[PDB]
Structure 1
């Protein structure tokens, strides 16, 4: 499969999440995603086909993981924006107030601004600390997916947010949204990963 931020993948033939970003670990191909999407060794599929397995994750506390892919997968420095793409150009972290977008299999490509840093989410499984908050909308299944600026700076991976009874927070105003992502930089260093860029 072609590995593009925001696309769907399944975990053990069960849950669906979204790809974060193509990465390498030495010779090993991978993608980063959210930790709550799978346990170590869980099987990832795209397009009906096995593409790899969860190599490592931290969740709760953090919310991060990477999927170690077979060599047959095609890593790409891209995030889905409708039928188009946003090129991944680096991992510079944006400040509060910056515009940012996110991509995922439920709500597609959505944009807003960064409103706060170092936010704690109290999820079912436990607290997750250190999250960045934006007011782009999202919904269930967008977890793991890319957060990126239009200028191509990869920010992090979708963790959670204040989804409403319809499964998303797109039906409330931006001022009322809390959409939380796990910062990319600590994921990259904890697992020794390099971001695929173009």
Structure 2
């Protein structure tokens, strides 16, 4: 499968999540995603085919993971935007107030701005600390997907927020949305990963 940020993948033939970013660990190909998406060794599938398994994850506390893929996968330095793509160029962290977009299998590509950093989410499983908050909308299934600036600086992966009863926060004004992402810098250093760029 071609690995692009934002596309759907399933975990153990049950849950759905979105790919965050193509990465390498030495000769190993992988993608970073949300920790809530799977446990170590869970099986990830793309379009019904097995593409790899969860190599490590932390959740709750943090919300991160990486999936090691088979050598047959094609890593690409891109994030889905509809039928178009955003090229990944690096991981400079943007500041509060910067515009950012996110890509995921449920709401597609949505943009907003970063409103706060170091936010704690009290999920039922336990708190997740240090997340960055944005007001781009998102929905069930977007977890793990890419957060990136239009200039291509990858920011982090979708963790959660204030989903409404229709399964997303797109039906409430940007001012009331809390869409939280795990910063990518700490995941690349924790697991020794290098982002694929173009």
User: Under TM normalisation by the shorter chain, which class is it?
Assistant: over 0.9
Unmatched segments (≥5 aa) in structure 2? none
Q: Distance in 2 between matches of 1:3 and 1:170?
A: 26
TM-score (norm 2): 1.00
Q: Superposition pairs for residues 14-33 of structure 1, below 5 Å?
A: 14-33=14-33
Q: Distance in 2 between matches of 1:138 and 1:151?
A: 21
- Give every structure 1 segment of 4 or more consecutive aligned residues whose post-TM-superposition deviation is greater than 2 Å: none
Q: CA deviation at 1:55?
A: 0.0
Q: Distance in 2 between matches of 1:101 and 1:24?
A: 23
Q: CA deviation at 1:64?
A: 0.1
Q: Distance in 1 between matches of 2:124 and 2:78?
A: 32
Aligned residues: 198
1:155 aligns with 2:148: no
Q: CA deviation at 1:124?
A: 1.1
Q: CA deviation at 1:46?
A: 0.1
Q: Distance in 2 between matches of 1:171 and 1:196?
A: 34
- The DSSP-based 3-state class of the residue aligned with 1:9 is strand
For residue 65 of structure 1, what is the aligned residue in structure 2? 65
- The DSSP-based 3-state class of the residue aligned with 1:188 is helix
Q: Distance in 1 between matches of 2:161 and 2:134?
A: 9
Q: CA deviation at 1:12?
A: 0.2
TM-score (norm 1): 1.00
Cα-Cα RMSD: 0.2
Q: CA deviation at 1:32?
A: 0.1
1:79 aligns with 2:79: yes
